[PDB]
Structures are given as C-alpha cells and as structure tokens.
Amino acid sequence: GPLQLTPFLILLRKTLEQLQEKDTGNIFSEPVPLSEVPDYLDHIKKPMDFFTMKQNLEAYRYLNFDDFEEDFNLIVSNCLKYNAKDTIFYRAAVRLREQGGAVLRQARRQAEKMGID
C-alpha cells in the first residue's frame, strides 16, 4: 500500500503499536460489529478502535498529537459508557486507560521536542 514517511507519522506508528500492546485481549483491535450489537449507536455517537486509528494515521488524517490522543480516549470512553462496570470489557478499558496514559505522556514529549505536537 501507499506509505508516507515523515517524523510525525513515524512517531504516531510507534505510539500506536505501544498502545495496542497494552490491549492484551485484542478487545479494541476492530470496530464493534453493529450487526451483532444492534443497540451500540443508540449510546455511542462516534465508535473508535485501533484498526480505524491505523487507517486514519496512514491516510494523514491525524495532523497533530491532540487529535490522535482524542481518538484513543474515545476507544476508552465509549467502552466505559456502553458496557456495565462488572463486564470484562469495562475492566479492560480501565486497564487500557491507565497503561495508555503513560504511553501518551512519553510520546507527546517527543512530539513537542521535535517540532511536531
């Protein structure tokens, strides 16, 4: 496929893989299937998942670090909104939020040190 090489997209690639590594169950790897979860959009305005984040990255739809981060935060916040607290999914989203926070803090520092956050 096409492949764009800029320092910012290089950083987003690394950061994204670092985030996905924290989702040990691959719970967030793909869109929630609306065909199996027909009430999902009743609750969720903008679904997000890591496959979609990767495609956004590669298309140059993230132009700054904030916008990338906002989509990671959606993954988490959507999951916490839709699923009940006692579910494995909710609990997975809490773990992801806390581990991903550290990843994003480090990466943002790098984006700022380069002229690119």
Partner: peptide, 10 residues
Amino acid sequence: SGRGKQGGKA
C-alpha cells in the same frame, strides 16, 4: 450501558 456484548461475563 446498553444491552451488552456477548462474552463479557467476569
């Protein structure tokens, strides 16, 4: 929350 995704029981 909504109806729930299968396979979520802890």
